[PDB]
Amino acid sequence: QVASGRAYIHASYNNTIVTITDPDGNPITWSSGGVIGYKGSRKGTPYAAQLAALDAAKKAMAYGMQSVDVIVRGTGAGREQAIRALQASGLQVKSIVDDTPVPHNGCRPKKKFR
């Protein structure tokens, strides 16, 4: 059981996965569009991210989770909504920092991205 932690939001065009970790970074629980019940493209939607972040925060609270730091990676349609849900969850959200990974022109992207 741990009091403060982290919440990572991985938001892609296809899905939103939210995993809640301890202070050192190790996961306590996680959820996603799939876990909350959707398959296919519906997983990618804002309503999907909502249920996901809730279920992720709901599961975290029963381990004593109370305050979290919010880390956001992605530019998916579920992103901003995912954050809404974490705030409205019963969790503190001491911060919201975006650590989306971007290359300083690295590996050649797949063709869909050119």
Binding site: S95, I96, V97, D98, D99, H104
Partner: protein
């Protein structure tokens, strides 16, 4: 709010002047455009070249997580 204004005489070739330099980076670490630095072409180029040296030295960052 042009940055070139909010400073006195300074050196663009001075790559150790971290206190000046860091003001030309966005809060995300990126070298700022001419619209925000207020530099010419000529100067803005030396700006970029020395910020780049600086990050090599450890003095300036290469990137920074964005907070809200």
């Amino acid at each position: 709010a042009k940055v070139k204004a909010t400073l006195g005489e300074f050196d663009l070739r001075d790559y150790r002047n971290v206190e000046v330099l860091k003001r030309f980076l966005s809060e995300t670490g990126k070298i700022l455009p001419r619209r925000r630095t207020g530099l010419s072409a000529k100067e803005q180029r030396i700006l970029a070249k020395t910020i780049k040296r600086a990050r090599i030295l450890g003095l300036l960052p290469f990137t920074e997580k964005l907070v809200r």
